[PDB]
């Protein structure tokens, strides 16, 4: 209830003019008071439209100002161009910055003037420094200046922060004011005509530096930020890679005193085990060389901070390092050229000096692993393999973005990347031919996409036709299903919605064991992902072909085989300016349904093969192996205690044993710690990487101005929990400026806290971080009922595409390829279902969401709507609340810290109740209705749709499920069986969980199965209305948790809920009209 004041102050500061007037608009759920709000509105519009003073009416309608609820504030201020500079001149009295062209290796990667690299605009491209975000540099500068101005009179520790950040913004703005501000167009791009006479890499550097200096709360933060901002102005290729590299060695220096374990995918069972740190000497020499490079780059304070820690090597001073490890990834992306980014991968050293004893075993192990995956379904003749064509054709929506191709749906032209749409086009024109897999050769090389991530190399992405997906789909789904229960596939061991994300190293760490962990992300152009890898799979397919008797299955397997034949020789379109290069690359990368699990297989075979060579010199028992994409780790135990010399010799043997297969590696062996892309451990304590740029993005998405603010808030919350903390008021300023909308040149609207923080398709953030807010009031209920009426909108593009002839042909072909003779009873159902997977195409979503925002805006302008009784969540909570009673409690501390970097209140909760131990289905995947969909398809259907579908009669359930690819007999059996009644409750569980972010954010980290939380939640049991007692216990838990988060202290509860209200609510249960935005979720693991 504080945000709107900051909004008002932002408006007053940014505009400042006599002509700048400020126009609130209010609402109340009570008619008479609402008409007085309407009156105030009216009179304000008039007064605005007559240059009359507004300050007089504000007393007359005092009641509305005190008790009614605000919506938004309008603003009439003219163009008044270039006022940002006219304000900014004062904060730029420092010295500007000079580039240094002889730092980056390349020529165009220096921060020199555009004209020195692109004299003509016809060869200009802003894509090497495009922020790719619908928010301006000017927005950032205005926000910083507003923060600095309002915090210009404080006298505390805050002032010690303020002087520091003021100096940082001085350093930045001197450099900016030296030349000027680039001006955004309507699309938030930056054209040639502003950058023609200015440095090319000023924008990303500026934004990244603003984000960093806005995340300063301490002295070391100031040192680090000043030491990166001033060097990131020139160095743009060897900086985040530099400071983020030693961490991998540092984790091998922290003694464990106390540990965490994993059992099943979120279980913990702590251990007081102590483990020393047997680090060799030569890795210190390596580390010393790395610090010499660090100092050689122009870094002074942060080596000293890295140097004074080694005197003790303690874990209490260690979070600084972790903090440092996150300060490296908030400098921006290294958006270099497609060519030079491919050549990070396309350097090959293929040699007729590798072993042959190794590759044959490698090939065989891949073959054997494949056979273990596929023995059962290939043999028992599963339906999903026979009809693999139809399976992939349904599951196209869960695929990659194919190359743009010109379509026509009746009377339009489309350049879609979605392969389902490609299929729709090719069926009509006789071009659909899935059995004949295209070659990939000189006559038709392959396109590319670029998988980027800062501080590392650029990975490549295949962008293929739609036959490759269809071939790989069914076989890869059975392989993944097999890997759900296999432990060693770290990407895929789960229980249908989880990953082993807290690792499985710490079981067998001891004084006798060691662990070798290894980054394997560069192993795409390598000689072990070419020929042997493919041929092992070919061999497995031969065996599997002899392991079935049906012909459809053998054909499907032969098509998958033929796909691997074509992938063994594969060329690659790569432009460079005007001319086009094509390079032989017959190997593996991402952009495929198969790449992930198959790379995991190949790394597993590789490490199993290598690890049987250390056996020539050591006796050990392989206890555990894990492989997940861009990393892999294996633990191993000895007959004795570990020494430095065994570590050194093992490392040399591992390095040379990879060299025997012609494979480069920075081999890393340790005893207590690991480092990988997504996480790392020191001293039996899990830390995480907070490297998600907020004000700069990887590539250019498709979301609106609105939703990118929500994405940024989720990333903000995440990074805060990780450790990287930014000052929240700046973020709120960005959110309001990104939700601000221009109705004319001078009219602009700004919504309020009570529109943006309400559970709908328009939620963006919360008034108090780590806490969703609900509505006990009339007013939040009122607007939630209003916004649900408006969330449902239309897309004319989708309506006209579904009315053409080709779509109709596609629906007909789906039917007669699946079932026939109900052409007007189910086929229409299948069209309505195909509509559910046209929405992946982005412009449809933009049409629909822009329509939602405009419909929202035409009642943000004018007064409010009653919305006609449509029941939602706050209606229920309104009725649950008046039979509560709170009382002060006092819980003790009995749970262990294992995420130090958290804010102290969340940690206090974790340090008093447990951390989560299960993961209950956000999708309802284990639900008996969903185990059909995961059997005949991959398709999601959103929990809104399922929660709705179950509310209907037993007739249209059959239509809706058969329309999702499922056959008719099992649907009829499901309805006759009466299993939906055994699944109303699970679906509603998942629904309510999706509505309230229970599996999305901070609430993913908390134990609701605790005995300590439960004894506070004293709601007696009634029985035979399970939903009510369920929601009551859940909501009471949420009350206690929100009180804990927002105030630190604890409370109890009690609800002697009357049976009358139990029954009144039981009927309100399965008629809920509520919804939560996809863009608002904050997955802690990305």
């Amino acid at each position: 209830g504080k945000y709107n004041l900051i909004l008002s102050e932002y408006l007053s500061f940014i505009y400042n003019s006599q002509s700048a007037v400020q126009i609130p608009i209010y609402y109340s759920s009570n008619s008479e008071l609402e008409n007085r709000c309407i009156e105030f509105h009216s009179k304000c519009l008039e007064n605005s439209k007559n240059g009359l003073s507004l300050k007089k009416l504000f007393v007359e309608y005092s009641d509305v100002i005190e008790n009614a609820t605000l919506l938004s504030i309008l603003s009439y201020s003219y163009d008044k161009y270039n006022a940002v500079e006219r304000k900014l001149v004062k904060y730029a009295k420092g010295k500007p910055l000079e580039a240094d062209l002889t730092v980056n290796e390349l020529d165009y990667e220096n921060n020199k003037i555009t004209s020195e690299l692109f004299p003509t605009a016809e060869e200009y491209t802003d894509l090497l420094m495009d922020p790719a975000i619908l928010t301006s540099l000017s927005s950032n500068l205005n926000a910083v200046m507003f923060w600095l101005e309002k915090h210009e009179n404080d006298v505390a520790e805050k002032l010690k922060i303020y002087k520091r950040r003021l100096d940082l913004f001085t350093i930045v703005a001197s450099t900016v004011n030296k030349y000027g501000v680039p001006r955004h167009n309507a699309k938030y791009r930056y054209e040639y005509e502003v950058m023609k006479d200015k440095p090319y890499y000023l924008v990303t550097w500026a934004n990244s530096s603003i984000e960093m200096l806005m995340s300063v709360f301490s002295h070391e933060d100031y040192l680090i930020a000043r030491e990166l901002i001033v060097l990131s102005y020139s160095n743009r290729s060897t900086l985040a890679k530099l400071v983020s590299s030693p961490m991998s060695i540092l984790v091998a220096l922290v003694d464990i005193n106390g540990t965490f374990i994993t059992n099943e995918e979120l279980e913990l069972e702590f251990s007081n085990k102590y483990v020393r740190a047997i680090v060799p000497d030569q890795t210190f020499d390596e580390l010393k060389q790395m610090l010499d490079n660090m100092r050689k780059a122009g870094l002074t304070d942060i080596p000293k901070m890295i140097q004074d820690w080694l005197v003790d090597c303690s874990i209490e001073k260690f979070p600084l390092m972790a903090k440092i490890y996150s300060w490296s990834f908030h400098v921006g992306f290294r958006k270099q050229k497609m060519l030079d980014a491919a050549l990070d991968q396309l350097k090959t050293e293929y040699t007729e000096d590798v072993d042959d004893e190794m590759y044959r075993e490698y090939t065989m192990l891949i073959r054997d692993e494949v056979v273990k995956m596929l023995e059962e379904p290939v043999k028992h003749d599963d339906h999903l393999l026979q009809d693999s064509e139809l399976a992939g054709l349904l599951s196209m929506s869960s695929a990659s973005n194919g190359e743009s191709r010109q379509l026509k749906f009746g009377r339009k032209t489309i350049f879609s990347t979605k392969k389902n749409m490609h299929v729709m086009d090719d069926m009509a024109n006789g071009r659909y031919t899935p059995g004949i897999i295209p070659p990939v050769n000189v006559d038709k090389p392959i396109p590319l996409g670029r998988r980027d991530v800062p501080g590392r190399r650029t990975r490549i992405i295949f962008i293929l036709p739609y036959e490759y997906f269809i071939a790989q789909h069914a076989v890869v789904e059975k392989m993944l299903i097999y890997a759900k229960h296999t432990r060693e596939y770290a990407e895929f061991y789960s229980q249908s919605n989880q990953l082993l994300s807290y690792g499985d190293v710490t079981r067998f760490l001891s004084n006798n064991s060691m662990v070798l962990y290894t980054d394997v992300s560069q192993w795409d152009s390598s000689q072990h992902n070419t020929q042997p890898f493919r041929k092992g799979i070919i061999m497995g397919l031969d065996m599997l072909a002899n392991m079935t008797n049906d012909a459809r299955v053998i054909q499907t397997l032969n098509l998958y085989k033929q796909t691997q034949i074509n992938l063994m020789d594969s060329y690659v379109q790569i432009p460079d300016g005007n001319v086009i290069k094509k390079i032989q690359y017959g190997a593996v990368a991402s952009g495929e349904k198969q790449t992930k699990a198959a790379n995991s297989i190949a790394n597993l075979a590789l490490i199993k093969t290598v690890l049987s060579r250390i056996s020539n010199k050591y006796s050990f028992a392989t206890k555990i192996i894990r492989v997940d994409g861009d990393d892999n780790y294996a633990v191993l135990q000895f007959n004795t205690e570990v020494t430095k010399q065994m570590v050194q010799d093992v490392s040399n043997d591992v390095r040379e044993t990879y060299a025997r297969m012609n494979t480069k590696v920075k081999a890393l062996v340790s005893t207590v710690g690991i480092e990988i892309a997504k996480r790392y451990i020191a001293g039996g304590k899990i830390f995480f990487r907070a490297g998600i740029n907020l004000l700069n993005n990887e590539k250019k998405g498709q979301s609106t101005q609105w939703d990118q603010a929500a994405v940024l808030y989720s990333n903000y919350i995440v990074n805060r929990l990780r450790g990287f903390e930014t000052d929240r008021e700046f973020i709120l300023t960005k959110i309001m400026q990104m939700t601000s909308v221009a109705i004319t040149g001078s009219l602009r609207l700004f919504p309020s806290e009570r529109v943006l923080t309400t559970n709908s398709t328009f939620k963006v953030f919360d008034s108090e971080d780590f806490i969703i807010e609900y509505g006990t009031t009339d007013d939040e209920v009122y607007i939630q009922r209003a916004f649900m009426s408006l969330s449902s909108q239309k897309s004319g593009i989708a309506d006209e595409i579904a009315a053409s002839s080709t779509f109709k042909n596609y629906v007909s072909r789906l039917s007669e390829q699946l079932l026939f003779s109900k052409n007007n009873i189910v086929s229409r159902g299948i069209a309505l279902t195909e509509k559910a997977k046209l929405n992946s195409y982005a412009p449809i979503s933009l049409e629909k969401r822009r329509a939602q925002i405009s419909a929202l805006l035409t009642m943000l302008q004018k007064p409010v709507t009653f919305k006609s009784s449509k029941i939602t969540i706050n209606d229920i909570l309104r009725d649950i609340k008046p039979f509560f009673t709170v009382n002060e409690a006092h819980l003790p501390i009995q749970y262990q810290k294992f995420m130090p970097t958290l804010p102290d209140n969340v940690q206090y909760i974790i340090q008093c109740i447990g951390s989560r131990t299960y993961q209950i289905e956000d999708d309802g995947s284990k639900s008996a209705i969903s185990r059909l969909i995961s059997k005949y398809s991959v398709y999601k259907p959103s929990i809104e749709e399922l929660y709705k579908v179950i509310s209907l009669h037993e007739n249209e359930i059959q239509l809706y499920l058969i329309s999702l690819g499922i056959p008719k007999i099992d649907a009829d059996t499901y309805v006759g069986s009466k299993i939906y009644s055994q699944d109303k409750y699970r679906i509603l569980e998942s629904y309510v969980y999706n509505l309230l972010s229970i599996n999305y954010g901070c609430y993913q980290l908390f134990d609701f199965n605790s005995p300590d939380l439960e004894k506070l939640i004293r709601i007696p049991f009634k029985g035979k209305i399970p939903a009510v007692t369920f929601i009551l216990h859940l909501y009471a838990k949420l009350e206690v948790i929100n009180h804990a988060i927002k105030n630190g202290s604890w409370i109890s509860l009690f609800c002697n809920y009357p049976k009358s209200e139990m029954i009144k609510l039981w009927k309100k249960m399965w008629n809920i009209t509520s919804l939560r935005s996809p863009y608002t979720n904050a997955n802690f693991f990305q």
């Binding site: 374990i261 059992n263 099943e264 279980e267 913990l268 069972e269 702590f270 251990s271 007081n272 085990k273 102590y274 229980q495 079981r507 067998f508 001891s510 004084n511 006798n512 135990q637 004795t640 205690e641 009995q894 749970y895 447990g914 951390s915 131990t917 299960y918 055994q982 409750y985 699970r986 569980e989 134990d1007 609701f1008 199965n1009 605790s1010 005995p1011 439960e1014 004894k1015 709601i1019 049991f1021 029985g1023 035979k1024 399970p1026 939903a1027 007692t1029 369920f1030 216990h1033 859940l1034």
Partner: protein
């Protein structure tokens, strides 16, 4: 490696407690016992393999036939079944019995599974190992809502300051052979003192070890299943009998668990140098019975043996601690004896004792008084000086 006879090695001083710090030095013995407890926690193995916690609870729930979505409300049977408590119990029991540290119980009476798993606990573990009020409360609860209700007996009339615990005063009243002999075993279960390899040891019965106590337990519990509850309703009977069927179905795993605890306990007892007395202590260790129920319910076909290196570590740690202890004792004894034989009368024999306690790197000498130090001096007066120091002094 073979080592020649030119080589040498020094033997530690593993001479037992000359001070009897388990005789009215309770403030020191509490810290010592806590130190050995927390040390023992760092060497008990982690439960590497279990049964999943959701693939069990659905089997349990359908065995119990519970209303849907009561899983998140946790009708009291299902509270605290998780891991992060089972390992905690496994660690606590073993480390306490090794350190001889008394442990108190924090449970709830609405949860009938806690009372049921307290039987397994109070059988496999002696009762003189707990602290009195806790098992008094727990035994009282068990008697009042599982045993006496199974024969129409009255609730109880228990007395606060009573020399006997409820299982003792219950052993003679009720008339059923099975439960009576079970309670007889429980009440008369106690440790056996025995000196082996020089060190005193508190050893179990030799029937708990080769696990057959659990068969007496199953006999008693099965009898109570076989009774009727005339005085009480059907829901009550149903709840209780399902609650003990959930343990009956886990029988063989419980037997294995019992044998595993006994084995690891004696195996770790082997790596002890200082004699281990059975004496109560100031501070205790909490034990929620939901953390027992977890261990007793999330377990199966998953053995955990302490690695030899952990054993060697624990043994060398205890050896070095013991040697340091005796050596610093010898220092203090030399200077004290010397002070008394050289007539140094203005000398306050405190700073010597401050040095003595500082070199044992576990105490806080800033907040330990002068009287304990002087009593320690008073005991040290009556100790023979070792040969080296005595000869050098004479």
């Amino acid at each position: 490696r073979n080592l020649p006879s030119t080589a040498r090695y020094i033997r530690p001083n593993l001479l037992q407690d000359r001070l009897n710090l388990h005789d009215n030095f309770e403030s020191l013995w509490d810290t010592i016992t806590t130190s050995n407890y927390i040390l023992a926690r760092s060497v008990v193995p982690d439960l590497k393999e279990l049964v999943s916690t959701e693939a069990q609870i659905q089997k349990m729930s359908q065995d119990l036939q519970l209303e849907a979505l009561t899983i998140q409300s946790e009708t009291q049977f299902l509270t605290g079944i998780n891991s992060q408590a089972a390992n905690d119990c496994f660690k606590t029991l073993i480390a306490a019995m090794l350190s001889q540290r008394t442990m108190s119980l924090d449970f709830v009476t609405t949860n009938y599974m806690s009372l049921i798993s307290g039987m397994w606990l109070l059988t496999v573990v002696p009762n003189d190992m707990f602290i009195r009020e806790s098992l008094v409360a727990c035994q009282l609860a068990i008697i009042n809502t599982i045993i006496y209700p199974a024969f129409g007996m009255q609730r109880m009339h228990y007395r606060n300051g009573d020399p006997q615990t409820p299982f003792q005063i219950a052993e003679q009243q009720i008339q059923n052979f099975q439960v009576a002999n079970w309670l007889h075993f429980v009440n008369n279960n106690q440790f056996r003192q025995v000196v082996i390899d020089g060190v005193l040891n508190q050893v179990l019965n030799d029937n708990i070890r080769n696990g057959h106590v659990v068969n007496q337990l199953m006999e008693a519990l099965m009898q109570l299943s076989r009774q009727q509850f005339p005085t009480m309703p059907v829901d009550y009977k149903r709840s209780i009998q399902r609650g003990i069927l959930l343990l009956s179905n886990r029988l063989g795993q419980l037997v294995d668990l019992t044998r595993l605890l006994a084995y690891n306990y004696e195996t770790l007892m082997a790596c002890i140098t200082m004699n281990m007395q059975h004496v109560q202590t100031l501070t205790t260790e909490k034990l929620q019975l939901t953390s027992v129920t977890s261990l007793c319910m999330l377990i199966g076909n998953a053995t955990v043996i302490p690695s030899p290196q952990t054993l060697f570590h624990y043994y060398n740690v205890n050896v070095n601690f013991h040697s340091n202890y005796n050596e610093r004792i010898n220092d203090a004894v030399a200077i004290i004896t010397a002070a008394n034989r050289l007539n140094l009368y203005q000398k306050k024999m405190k700073s010597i004792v401050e040095d003595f306690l500082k070199r044992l790197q576990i105490f806080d000498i800033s907040r330990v008084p002068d009287d304990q130090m002087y009593r320690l001096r008073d005991r040290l007066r009556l100790l023979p000086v070792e040969i080296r120091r005595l000869d050098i002094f004479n």
